[PDB]
Structures are given as structure tokens and as C-alpha cells.
Ligand binder design. Structure first.
Ligand SMILES: Nc1nc2c(c(=O)[nH]1)N(C=O)[C@@H](CNc1ccc(C(=O)N[C@@H](CCC(=O)O)C(=O)O)cc1)CN2
Ligand SMILES: Nc1nc2c(c(=O)[nH]1)N(C=O)[C@@H](CNc1ccc(C(=O)N[C@@H](CCC(=O)O)C(=O)O)cc1)CN2
Ligand SMILES: Cc1ncc(COP(=O)(O)O)c(CNCC(=O)O)c1O
Ligand SMILES: Cc1ncc(COP(=O)(O)O)c(CNCC(=O)O)c1O
Ligand SMILES: Cc1ncc(COP(=O)(O)O)c(CNCC(=O)O)c1O
Ligand SMILES: Cc1ncc(COP(=O)(O)O)c(CNCC(=O)O)c1O
Lengths: 472, 469, 468, 472
């Protein structure tokens, strides 16, 4: 005998699965009672979340709006078309000159589909080296030659690097490498590079070597939409992005591509037009993905409408101002930030001058409800014990924090890193020994208490703190 | 100035985005008001949907539980661990013999990561030919040599086929092809095959040619969990699946892999153990994916608890009984089913004795709120059949007599497609003139909506929905 | 102090290197005093050898005639042009319909260059399975997936097979495999296949699946030139060959390719022309090879003039007649030949009915100065021996002499069975019967007495250092 | 009727094929009546030529000595084993530490077989860029990214370059590129590099990036045998070579490889041994080649015996001395030589300062019986009209010429380039116009006559001038 639909199918999570419900409620409290500084995290809206958790998950809709493989897509088509049009609008793109595919499941899927669309297996790519600030999917292999990302397996990667002393992209060495290596695709955009990008120079280099130029704006896409950092669309053939970082949406990816007439170029025929659209669509489906996740597409449509608002531009301005204010506070104490500041939403903090690795700082911070991530910095070699920590402003800025509040975050981070150093000095640099200092540490308890009191002062998007199971 | 958190961040969707809210409400109505027969669709529970739409979407958690690239994962780790443990439980697997990765974003990502874990670029794969019922990701290139799936771009695929007169997998031709082509990986399981799989024979073939054996149980995973079809875990090295078809969960993928001591094989050393776990995990992350989608993982844990219940076992049995009853009704009308029946959740209807392409029947049905999909059949492009599935309408509480009624609605829809064809010709341009102001289409559509609208609907409250008519 | 030019540079080999000179003289004796049945071997002419051993070896001439990367090629260009023109003439080809590159160093270089010209890495190829009679370069991997031939490493191969009942190519199975696997290139021609090829059916299959069709005629090129077997040029896009087997020339390779208007095809524009020439030339050089071996090209031009003569046509006819007569003799002794006969220069002897592996028969024959080679047979340690007529036919042997060869082979196999019955099947045990065996000694002596009678091309027996 | 064996098979070339005989005789006269300066050419001995044109061509001998597929190899095995042993002896190698495969048909086959033995498809290699002096088979693709050599198709190439100002290998940039690109194999040795190689530094770079190190000594192999240039065997894992250049043998290749215990290295197990022999043999056969060319192997055995003589060491010294004397003469005329001199058998002459392309100089020289080749130089782009010409000493040194004779060669070249300039000044630089100036040019005729009178003063190896058909 089947359970009635009402029993298995309409009963709330809190009754169906108390264990999972409790864990979500614990996670909700964690998110609003600590200081969340992972640069790739944000707190999305309740409206996005209501779309994400909806009947849209039930629909198979392989293909393109209007050109589907299944029937029943009358409304899914309108949702996807709205998502696509709102994506172009959010980035101030003319639909005659740009198209967008909104089906990628996430950022790594989006990049792999973009590469599959324009590259054959083993074709050459150049992206920013991971330890210089680029992403895994920009062709990451280690200095020891170990291929880590599939983008260094299925494609041939030659990363370009920042200058080892200034931390800024070395555009001269980029050009020299591109002319020697002759990549089919040059990738710009990054995960931990704290400066803006000279897309014009990237276009000059790509033209000199005959490469396509792709910007992966995942981290800063919200700043791009708000016209608060350089726009990659002016110069790049393809722009990929996630939607869950500074864009403040669901977890999804998007691939933007040029359409229409190509700009004049020597040797190029008259009336030549871009030919990315069909290849990009085909790479996403049927080549790589299956059914779109329509609940993510619907949720993304909501986020893109929210991103196009006056309030969102103010948010993006505030994100940048908070990151700068945090950076100045840390540098005043003598902490080493890569490039000595930031022009975006994050700072990259080199802990090697302190004799610390990023895992120790991440671990101690976590016990204080300060959420960061350890992060590779130039020249290090251990991913799980790297030389740095990365700090981002988007998530707490979404809770309404301003510059003075980010200065308090700076002080909390100074306390945490100081305490990390004191524990290492007393208990040892070996992780096994360092860990003994994390037990019954009154200063950790004091800092945790201060962090939670501070965090409780701010509102929180995505759910009602007043109705959460675990209150103060 | 920034908008207050409450305004942009706590206001309900209906107010923030009326355009999208309305479209979701129209889609909710559409799901209520049709006969949903796409064999890969289902209607998941409100409990799954509540976990899917939750603050779990905010978290970066790359890595594995207890070994992450980011802080703050104390609760995300517990959710993922519980998801993995419930996945092993739902499939009756011993955790010393099997592990599972629950991070794949969907089914196609799960498969591509499983392949990446065990194969180098250009290594050889064999899977069921798409026109024989296999999936795109099993190495689909057309009969024209057009590489369609990334599986055939980054790897070298050669499909195996069903017997061209019985519709069943031709195991002898599978063996002969495998011994000639020497694949590193043989894939079994499919998207439109209406029978069970002889995994024991697949294992004999894999052992004879030296291949790994992977089953993609995406379509029948719910039936596997309920022990209503053959278990691929008895014989396969790796089992992939989606979680949203017959398993009735969110859209996600899982990769199961053997762990522990290997069975005796000549030439293989003693005390040898499986070495899939680290390669599978690495392929998912950092090789292919980035951050896990924790709201999917949380929602999946919910679906896996639901799948291990006696009610779900009864559901799986009913899915099978409904598929048989529908196939029997259609065959009682003289229609042709591939293999003459079914052993699972679907039927593959051969429209060849009728003169209709799948797209004709599929498009007519869509106008009547009957959602099927055109489907290639063995030896076809231009599909000669339609695929019909029982999971979704079974989840709405339908039983055998209701599926016999679905049979009659389909019999009416194909009869209409024929009458249109006889009146307007077989050429699609000419045929499309029958779908215009056709009172019989309108009459069938009304009968369908009136039949469909009465049934219960999981996932949301019909009493709260914006469009009740 | 530098040696005077005459001392190091003009003194004969016999004085400069007595060690190597003596070994060459011993090898000349060996070629005279045995029955050479390796189907890929021949005895070329002294005229070819004089061109091969000449100052043409000194020249760098990368490029094509009239378009070289080095100066000084006024005469090398005329030699290569003459070689190419004689290659087209020897195979009765219209120079407006066919071109040829004569630079490949040997047969395997010729094939790999042909593949490189028309395929990208990992593109799909089908060729005759090695155990069905195909060549290594047509693709070969092991049951364990070990890729043996470079063709299977750099491209993706799938073999087609002969029918297990008839031993002939199974054309329906070839077609089915090609439609499933969708190769970019189908190779025909082989190394141990004793029948002719239905190139028309290969062309039908290639058209059905959209593949290019290449024939590797290395083994039967001499018979093709003499118009004694089917011409692959009627149906194939590209024809590769060696020049040292039945063509009786130096060791070299040639790649023939279509030129000019393409024949009508659906979905193909009007006035379409072939575009193989530049790709083929580029693949040979600069992609794969360096400087041509002009002594080989000159010697090849000689061999191609010799191949176009009525004497060579008679030779090709005699090769076929000798192989038939030998196959008939062996088959009258009750032995089993793959396909039950031959239509070319070789027979493929199935030893499985006798309980012998090809390696046993080959090793015993070698001890008797009978040179054959163990050879895989369909459905297999190789279970057969391949025996060829070109080399002994070049020494003037006719059918009755090949019947005598058949009796020497019959004696060799009887002895091989008698050794097996006495010492056992294991080659460790079997090898004990080869020590101080007077019956091997007697067969070896009878073989030498038989062989040393006949004439020998390429050198004067009257001048050779070892006459006993 | 079959022709008697004597008619078709024993009759001399002069009777069987008068056209080819006549062409060989014209080529023989050309070789001994001009000045032959192609750096990759030599004049081999009559003894080598007698082995090359011999019954050895008739034998199929697939496999390795002892481990053959066919029978009948009693003597071919002794010839091949003698060739291999003499090869090791010629390069002063201990058979316990070095093995050699002598079956490669030429240099390009030898290199591709070495690569196939140790690399999988698409593995990375780094060789000297063609315009810097490396060979096609060292991974040549053009500055425009066009893949030319199959070594850039089947493998992934990133060339290293000479310093743009000095013309010497930039070892610092080699190391930097190798650490970024992470090649599996680094190739040293070259075709037009006029200096010796710092194999020690190459070993240091290879060890730093975990690459194998291969030297292709084709051009200088004869100088290596005579210990007149640095020995690559001291530091390289594998050494490939042709045998027809400075080694003065037939056209063939060899692959030398290390055997036995590996030198100590951190992270390398105890008792570890080299594993090249089987892979290299297998790559040559059955993977790549078919039947060995036993007449080449026999001829090579002769050449290797000759290369181990005291006379050959004096020859190698004279080759270097003649190249230096020629270079001094040309530079004393103000001509531009890459690196301003030579340490081997060649000079590389940059004609761009004169406003000349190398095809013009090559073409005019050819009309004067002066055989050179146009040669790419650093920074040019056209292959059939490049910026330099390459001049080598081996071939005329084999005819007995010494330094004073090579100064006369420099004078002829000075006359030839001067005359090339005059024709360009009169007729212009476009090739169709410049070619008009080569008709009825009295100074060309006079220079050609002088070259021929000079060339006729010297002996000639490989054939008896007294016996040749076309006499003075
Ligand atoms: N500049 C940059 N920072 C970033 C990312 C990035 O892609 N680029 N990330 C994007 O998400 C996170 C780091 N993700 C990483 C994942 C794997 C490895 C890696 O090298 N793993 C090796 C080593 C493992 C070990 O030492 O234990 C491996 O998996 O074998 C590094 C970073 C966060 N910070
Ligand atoms: N430094 C160096 N000098 C050398 C060689 C070498 O490999 N390296 N060679 C070794 O043998 C010869 C030159 N071989 C070459 C062959 C092709 C191309 C080349 O770039 N071919 C292009 C462009 C042809 C064209 O412009 O017409 C092509 O074939 O498409 C360059 C050099 C002689 N001198
Ligand atoms: C056997 C099989 N495997 C994998 C997938 C892929 O799942 P995603 O769409 O989540 O990538 C499917 C989807 N098949 C959908 C259908 O048959 O209609 C499938 O049928
Ligand atoms: C620049 C960039 N591009 C793509 C991605 C991939 O997004 P997914 O995780 O959804 O695959 C990231 C993730 N970066 C995560 C981080 O920097 O912490 C990224 O930083
Ligand atoms: C360094 C080097 N290596 C290999 C080869 C190839 O040899 P083969 O031509 O026999 O394939 C050459 C030829 N170089 C000829 C020249 O420099 O003019 C070479 O210079
Ligand atoms: C059909 C075929 N093609 C190419 C080759 C290669 O020729 P080279 O050895 O010159 O590379 C052979 C050699 N076959 C030798 C034999 O059958 O005994 C061959 O049989």
C-alpha cells in the first residue's frame, strides 16, 4: 500500500526528516551568528530561495526555448527566456551583439562548456595561474606538473603569472608567453586576484597571437553588473560567470557570447559574423549536460532582476568600499596583502611573513565563528596548508555592514591571527601539536563570544531570523 | 543607499518578482492539469523541495566532509555524511564494500566524472546505442558519424545494440564487439530500454575483454532501491544514477563505487583491494566540479530517507504494475510495444505499424496536455516511436485502472493523429494544418484536464495555488 | 694528419673493412645456398644495386623537384622526376588522374605519412586484422589493449576479419563494422592474405560510411604492375606500396594519390577536384621525413623501368604459376591451405591440423636453409607458415622446381612431426631433437645441392668469395 | 618468356638504364667540380658505398639480433651486432652504461622513434626553436602557430630560443620556460647553431623540472666521436644522431640510450635502473618501422670503423679549423655571422644587414657551382626566402681542403654575395625581376669558371674521378 500523497508528498520537511531539518536550522544559525568572509559566498534573497525550492525542479526541458526535445515547456520556455533577457539587461548588453546561455549547472560546468564549444581536445589555453589568483578551471596544474583540473587534461594549459614582487599581472610576460605558446584561447578573470583587469591589453595580446579571449567574471559579476569594475564585454569574445558570488543569486553559471558582425580585422572577410551561439548552446546540450535545472534558472531570473536595481548598485559600491577599508586596517597592523590593497570585493593575505600557514588561521577562525578560507599565494605549494588566507566583503555587506563594521572585522581578524601565532609559539608548528592549543583556550572563547555578539546586530536575508529554531 | 535587508532579502517571491511567481504558478497548474508521461520525470515531495530551497545554497564546501577547502562546514559536513550513509542504506549496500559520492550536479556530470576517474582521454567505452535505448552520455554519435555527446568527443565510444527483431539486448553481439574493440569501460543501463539487464552476463563480458563495468541506473534507481528490479551492485564496479527520476528526489547525481578487497581474479595479486574511491572523488572535485550544491545534497538526503520506507517500496511496485497495465491496454488495441511489454517503469511504443513519426504523436499529445516524448526505436533522425513512463502519475496516486484510462487517452490521441494524417497527409507541413481549431483536439484536451485535475499533487498545496481553474 | 682521400675514401670495402666484407660475402653465399620462401623477400638486380650504392647518397634534397630547400639539385631533380613518371607508367596511370610521392624511406614510413596526410591524431582507421592477413601498419593492438603498431597509438584502429569458414574477407561484416565504427579511412591490401581483393566492394563500403579508401599493395605491387591481379587504382583514393617485394626494387616506399576532377557524388559540388597531392607531399616532408634518400630514388627509377618490361610481365605470371603449383603440391600431400589455394604470390599453410605451431616448422626449415616465416592464421603461437614465390622465381625456378620445393617442405614438416613425436611438444623439449640430427643434416645438404644450381641476380657468383 | 637472370639481374646499370646511369654520372661530376658547402652534406667513402649497394638489401630481418621474426639472419645478426658495438666504441661508451639501436632509416625516423619510446601522444617537449638553430623534428611550429613537424602534431612542443642580441642559447629563459611548461622531454642539439652546448646546464634544467634529456647530435656526431666538441653522453639520457653528416657515413640514424643503474637522485629508489632499452627497440620495431635496411646498417658499420681511426680525428679537427678560417675571412669582409664565429663545422651567415634573402644568395651561388642552402635566422618568417645562408666545412674538408683553401672559399662567397647585391641594385628585389639579372651575366660565368677550376684541384672520395663518364 502506497502512502497517501499528503503523507509522503505534502508534509513539511520538519516532520518528514527531523534530522535534516535540524541540520538546516543549525546551518541557518551559523550563517547569521558568525562573520562570513569567504569571498565566493553570499547570502541570497528569500525570493531567490522560493524560486529555487519550487515545482520547477520537476520538469525535463532539454533543448532551447522553442526548440525542446520534450513537450510541456510552455512556461519553462517563458522562464528561461526571461532569465536570458534579464541577464543581458543586467550587464547592459545589446541582444543584437550578445547572447547568453543560462543552463550551466555551476561555474565549472559553464567554463567547461565554453571551452568545449570553441576548442578541440588538446587545444591550447592560457589562464591566470592558480597561485597568481586564477581559478582551477583556467587550466590548473601544479608547479610539479600534476594535472589537477580537467581543464589541464582535456586541454593544453600554459598559465600566465603575476610579477613575483608586485603581485600584479605581468602583461609583458603574458604577451611573450602567448606569442611563444600560441594559445587558441586566453582566459582572464580570477578567483583571488585583488585588482582589476586590463581587458584592452588582453585584447591586444589575443589579437597579436590569434586567440579567442574569454573573461570568467564569476567573483566580480555583481560589481560588473553595477558598473563598478571594468566591463569585460567591451573586449572579450566570451564571458562566463557564476551567479552565486557577488551577483547574489542561486548557484548556477551563464555563458555570454558575441553575436552579429565581427569588428574589422586584417585578413578577415567582409561581413564576417560571430559564430559562437550555436556552438555554445550545443556544448551545453546535448554535448555536456542533460536536463536544465529549471528551479535554478527561475531563481536566477529573480536574482538578475534584483541585480538590475538601484539598491544593487549601492550594494556593489559598498562591497568595494568595505574591502578597501578592511585592507587598509590590516595593512596598518603590518599584515601582508597581495598588491598592497584591493580594487574589488576581496583581499588576499600572505601569512608567510608571520610563519603561519592558512589552514591554521582558517581552523582557529572557524572556532571563533569567523569563516574564511585558506588560500594559495604566489610560490607556495601546499593546497591544504597554503601560505595565505582570502577575505571577501560580499556576504557581510549583504547583511548591511559598512566600512566601520569592516574595520571591526579587521580587528577580529587581527585578534584571530595573533592568537593563531601565540598558539603556534606555545604549542608548536606541527599541526598535531598546534591543535592541542585549540582546546579550552579562553581567548578563543572570548573572541567567539565577541564575534557572535557583533554578528547578532545585523539583519539577515534569505530567511526570517525571528522564526528560526535556534535563537540567541 | 542600499536597500534594507528586509526589503530585497526577506520579501517573498510573489512581491519581489511577480512575473516569475506567476510563471511558477502557471507551471504548477500545468503539472496538475495534464497526464505527465515523460519516463524521466516525477513529482518530488514538499519536504525535498523545502531542503532544496534553503540557506544551504549559500555555502562553499569544496572537498570532502572533514577535509574541506573552506571553513564553516560543521553542519554541511553532517548533511553530506548523512546523505552518503542514507544512499548506501537505500541501496542495501555494505559500507565496507561500497562508497558513494553525492556531489555530482546531475546525471550527466555524474557519468562524465565517473569516466574521468577511470579513463584517460580517448580511452574506449561501449554503451547501449541511443537508438537501442541508451543515453547520450553513454557515447552517442549518430549513424552519420556526428559526435554528439562529450563522451564521444573526449573518449572513444562504440555502441552495442539490441537485436533488430526482438528488441532485447543482443548479448552475443555485445561480447563479439567488446572482444574486437577492447573497451576500457562497458556501460549498462539505459534511458528507453523496457526490460531488465543481465548484469551477470555483462560481468562475464567485461571479465572476458578486460573492461570495467559501470551501470547507469538513473531511470530505474527507485526500482533498484525498492528491490523491484535486478541490482546492478551485484556485478558492476561503479554505479551512477540521477536522483530525480524514479528515485523521486531532487535533480542531482551520485556515483557508487566498490571498496575493499577485490574478488579472486587470475593474475591479480592476493589481498588486492579496490582503488576507485580516491579517483572518483578527485574526478568530481577538483577535476571537474567546483563547489557542491549543498541544497541539492540536503534535499537528496531527504529523498533517500523517503526512498527507504515501506511506502516507497509500495510505490515502486505500483510503478511497475501501472506500466504493465498501460502496455497491456495499448497492446489490447493492437499497438506494438518494443519487446512486447515491460519489466520496468516505461513502455516503448512502436508507431511503425501505424505510419506516424514520434514527433507527430508527441506534438498532438502536447496540445491535449499529455506529455510524452518522441523516442528513437531500434533501427530508425526521425523517431518511429514514443516513450511512456509511469513514475510521475503513479506519484499522484494513480493505479492500474487509471493507467488503463491513460491508455485510452493515448489511444484517442493516436487515433486523432491518424485521422489528421489521413485528412491532411503525412508531410509535416501538411499535417500541421490539422492542429488548428480542431474540435477533437480541444475535446480530448478538456477530457484530459478534467481527468488529471482531480488527482492529488505532491510538492505543494493545491489549496494554496494561485490558479485553481 | 688527415688520411689521403684515396686511402680512406677510394679504397675498396674488402681492404677497408675485411670484417664487414667477409660477412657480406657470407650473406651472398647464404642467399645462394638456400630456398628463400619469405613472401616479402626478393633478389633485386645488379643495376638497381649499382644505383643504390652510388654518390646519390651524398645529396640533401628536401622539398620537391624544382622547389627544394637546398641548392645543387639540378640532377637529383631529374632523377626524382623520372622516378615519379616511371612509377605512374609502371602502374598504367594517367598523370592527370594520379600523382606519386617517391620519397618514403620504406613501406611503414609510406603508410604513416599517408595516414598523417589525411587523418588527425585519434581519427578512426579500419584495416585487415593481423591474424587475418593484414599488416602491422594497418593497426594492431593486443587483447589487453596494448597498442603495438604506431598506427594504433596515434590513430584509433578497428580491424576487419576474414570469414572463419572460407578464409576470405567477410564483406558483410566489413560493411557492418564500418557502419558502426565510422572510420575516416579504410585500408585494404595485406601481408599474408592469399586471395585478390574486391576493391569495388571496398569502394561501396567506403562510400556507404563516408571513409577514404587506401590500398597498401606492397606485397603484390609487382603483380599489379604486370596487370596480373586486380588494380586498386580503379577504386581507391590512395595506394601505398613498398618497392622491394614482388616489385623487385630497392627498399623504399611510394604513395600514389588521385588528382584532378572527382567523380560525381551526391551532396558534392560541381567541378570538385581531389586535394590529396599537397597534403601527401607535406606529410612526407616536412612533417615526417627529412632528406630524401636519393640513392633509393635512383635505384627505384631503375626498378620501375625494369618492372614495365615484357620480361617482368612474364616474371609476374610465373610467380603466380609457381605459387599455385606449390599450393597444389602441398594440398596433394593432404596439407591445409588457407582459402584452399592462392590467387597471388604466396600460400598460407594452416598447420593446426598437424598439431604443429608455425614456430616449430620455421625453426626446423631455417636449420635446413629453407627460409619461411611462422604466420598467424585466422582463429588462432601462430598456427601457420607463410610461403612466397617471388624470390625463387627471380632465380629462374618454374613450376616443376616449385614442386620440388613442395617436397622439401613436405620433408621438413614430416621431420618436424617426427621430432615432436619423439621429444615432445614443448619447444624446450622439442629443441632437443634439433641437436646433431642426421635427418636435418641430410635435408640441409639436399637443399644446398638444389639451391646452388640456380642463377642469382644482383651479383656475379663467379666473383663471390665463398663458392663452396 | 622470362628474361634470363643474367639479362635483367646481372647486367650493369650502364646497360640496363642508360638514362639513370647518365644522371648519376652528371651528379658525380657536379659533386667534384663545385664547392659543396651544405653543412649537413658530406662525401662518404667508396667502402661505405660498396656496402650500401650490396646483397644486404635483399634481407628481411624484423626484430633484434637473436630475437628475430624471420629466419635466415645468421649473418645479418653479426653485421648488426658489429654495427652496434662499433657505434658504442666510436663514441667511447661502455656497453654496461649505453646501448644503441641502429635500425632507424634516417635522422627524422630516429627522433620520432625515440619520442614514441618515452612519450605518450600529446606529452610535452622542448627543443631549440627552428629559427634559433633547432631541427624540424625538435617540435617545429611557426611563429604564426602553424604546426609543421609531426613532432608538433603528435606531441606538444614549446621551443626555447637563443638570446636575440648575442645569438647564444638563453639558458635562463630555457629554465624559466621549462619550469612553467613542465616538459616530459627536453631536446638539445641543433641544425644551424654555431656554438657548443652546455649539456651540464641542460641536465640541471632537466632535473629541476623532472624531464628526460635527449641530445640530437646529428650535425656534429663526427666531431663528438673525435672528442672535438662537448660529449652529450656525459649528461643526456638519450642521444640520437644521423650518420651521413659530419660522421661521414650512409644515410641512417641511431638512438643511444643509457643502461644500468641510475645515478643517485633524491626521491629515486635504491638500485633503480634505466628502462630505455626495451621501449626504444620496441618503438623502432614493431611500432614504427618494418624491415631494417641491412645495406644501410652494413654501410654504417663500415663508417663507424672509419670514424674510430686516427685519420678521422684529424679530419674532425680540420673541419673545425676550416670553419673558423672561413668565418674569420667572411667577418673580415664585414659580413654578419650569428654569434660572430663558430665552435663547430658551420657558420650561420645573416644576410639581412645586406638587404638580401638567402634564396637569392643560394640561387646565385648554385649558378656558380657553389652549393649552400638558404637558412632561417632568428626573427625571420619565410622558409623559402629566409634571412640567412648556412655554410658548412665537412664536405670539402673530406676532399682534402685546409684553411688556405677555405679562405679561397670565403673569397668566392664574397664575390658571389657581392654579385648578388649588384644584380639586386640593377634589377630590384622582386624575385621575377632579380631572376632576369641571372641571364647572360658575365661575372657569374667568370665566377663559375673560377670555382670549377678551383674544385678540380682536389681529390674526391666515393668514386674514381679518373673513371667517371664526364671529364674535364
Ligand atoms: N587562486 C585561487 N584560489 C582559490 C581557488 C582557485 O581555484 N584559484 N579555489 C576554487 O575553488 C579554492 C581552492 N581550491 C583548490 C582545490 C584544489 C587544489 C589543489 O591543488 N589540490 C591538490 C593538492 C591536494 C593536497 O595537497 O592535499 C590535489 O587535489 O591533489 C588547490 C585549490 C579557494 N581559493
Ligand atoms: N635551423 C634549421 N635550419 C635548417 C633545417 C632545420 O630543421 N632547422 N632543415 C632541416 O631539414 C633545412 C630547412 N628545412 C625547413 C623545412 C620547412 C620549413 C618551413 O617552415 N615550411 C613551411 C613554410 C613553407 C613556405 O613558406 O613555402 C611549410 O612547409 O608550410 C623550414 C625549414 C635546412 N636548414
Ligand atoms: C540513463 C540516464 N543517465 C543519465 C541521464 C542524465 O541525467 P541529467 O539530465 O540530470 O544529466 C539520463 C537523463 N535522461 C533523461 C530522459 O531519459 O528523458 C538518463 O536517462
Ligand atoms: C573565477 C571562478 N570561476 C569559476 C568558479 C567555479 O564556480 P563553481 O564552484 O560553481 O563551479 C569559481 C569558483 N571559485 C570558488 C572560490 O573562489 O572560492 C571561480 O572563482
Ligand atoms: C639536428 C638534426 N637532426 C635530425 C635531422 C634529420 O636527418 P634526416 O634528414 O636524415 O631525417 C637533421 C637534418 N638536417 C638537415 C640539415 O640541417 O640541412 C638535423 O639537422
Ligand atoms: C602490406 C605491407 N605493407 C607495408 C609493409 C612494410 O614495409 P617495410 O618493411 O619496408 O616498412 C609490409 C612489410 N611486410 C613484411 C612482410 O610481410 O614480411 C607489408 O607486408
Amino acid at each position: 500500500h502506497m502512502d497517501p500523497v499528503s503523507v509522503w508528498g505534502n508534509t513539511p520537511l520538519a516532520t518528514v526528516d527531523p534530522e535534516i531539518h535540524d541540520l538546516i536550522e543549525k546551518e541557518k544559525r551559523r550563517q547569521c551568528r558568525g562573520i562570513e568572509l569567504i569571498a565566493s559566498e553570499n547570502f541570497t534573497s528569500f525570493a531567490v530561495i522560493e524560486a529555487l525550492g519550487s515545482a520547477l525542479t520537476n520538469k525535463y526541458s532539454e533543448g532551447m526555448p522553442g526548440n525542446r526535445y520534450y513537450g510541456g515547456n510552455e512556461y519553462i520556455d517563458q522562464i528561461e527566456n526571461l532569465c536570458r533577457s534579464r541577464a543581458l539587461q543586467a550587464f547592459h548588453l545589446d541582444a543584437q551583439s550578445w547572447g547568453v546561455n543560462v543552463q550551466p549547472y555551476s561555474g565549472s560546468p559553464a567554463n567547461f562548456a565554453a571551452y568545449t564549444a570553441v576548442l578541440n581536445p588538446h587545444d591550447r589555453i592560457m589562464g591566470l595561474d592558480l597561485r597568481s589568483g586564477g581559478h582551477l578551471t583556467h587550466g590548473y596544474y601544479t608547479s610539479g606538473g600534476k594535472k589537477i583540473s580537467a581543464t589541464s587534461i582535456y586541454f593544453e594549459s600554459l598559465p600566465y603569472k603575476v610579477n613575483s614582487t608586485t603581485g600584479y599581472i605581468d602583461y609583458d610576460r603574458l604577451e611573450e608567453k602567448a606569442l611563444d605558446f600560441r594559445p587558441k584561447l586566453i582566459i582572464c578573470g580570477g578567483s583571488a586576484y585583488p585588482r582589476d583587469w586590463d581587458y584592452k591589453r588582453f585584447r591586444e595580446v589575443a589579437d597579436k597571437c590569434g586567440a579567442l579571449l574569454l573573461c570568467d567574471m564569476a567573483h566580480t559579476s555583481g560589481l560588473v553588473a553595477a558598473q563598478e569594475v571594468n566591463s569585460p564585454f567591451e573586449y572579450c569574445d566570451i564571458v562566463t560567470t557564476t551567479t552565486h558570488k557577488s551577483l547574489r543569486g542561486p548557484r548556477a553559471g551563464m555563458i555570454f557570447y558575441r553575436k552579429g558582425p565581427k569588428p574589422p580585422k586584417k585578413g578577415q572577410p567582409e561581413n564576417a559574423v560571430y559564430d559562437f551561439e550555436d556552438k555554445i548552446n550545443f556544448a551545453v546540450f546535448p554535448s555536456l549536460q542533460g536536463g536544465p535545472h529549471n528551479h535554478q534558472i527561475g531563481a536566477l531570473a529573480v536574482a538578475l532582476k534584483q541585480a538590475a536595481s538601484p539598491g544593487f548598485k549601492a550594494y556593489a559600491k559598498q562591497v568595494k568600499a568595505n574591502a578597501v577599508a578592511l585592507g587598509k586596517y590590516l595593512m596598518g597592523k603590518g599584515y601582508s596583502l597581495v598588491t598592497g590593497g584591493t580594487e574589488n570585493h576581496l583581499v588576499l593575505w600572505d601569512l608567510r611573513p608571520l610563519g603561519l600557514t592558512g589552514n591554521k588561521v582558517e581552523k582557529l577562525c572557524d572556532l571563533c565563528n569567523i569563516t574564511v578560507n585558506k588560500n594559495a599565494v604566489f610560490g607556495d605549494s601546499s593546497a591544504l596548508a597554503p601560505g595565505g588566507v582570502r577575505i571577501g566583503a560580499p556576504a557581510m555587506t549583504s547583511r548591511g555592514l559598512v566600512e566601520k563594521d569592516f574595520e571591526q572585522i579587521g580587528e577580529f581578524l587581527h585578534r584571530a591571527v595573533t592568537l593563531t601565532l601565540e598558539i603556534q609559539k606555545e604549542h608548536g608548528k606541527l599541526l598535531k601539536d598546534f591543535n592541542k592549543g585549540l582546546v579550552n583556550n579562553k581567548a578563543i572563547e572570548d573572541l567567539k563570544a565577541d564575534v557572535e555578539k557583533f554578528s547578532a546586530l545585523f539583519d539577515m536575508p534569505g530567511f526570517l531570523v525571528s522564526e528560526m529554531k535556534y535563537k540567541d
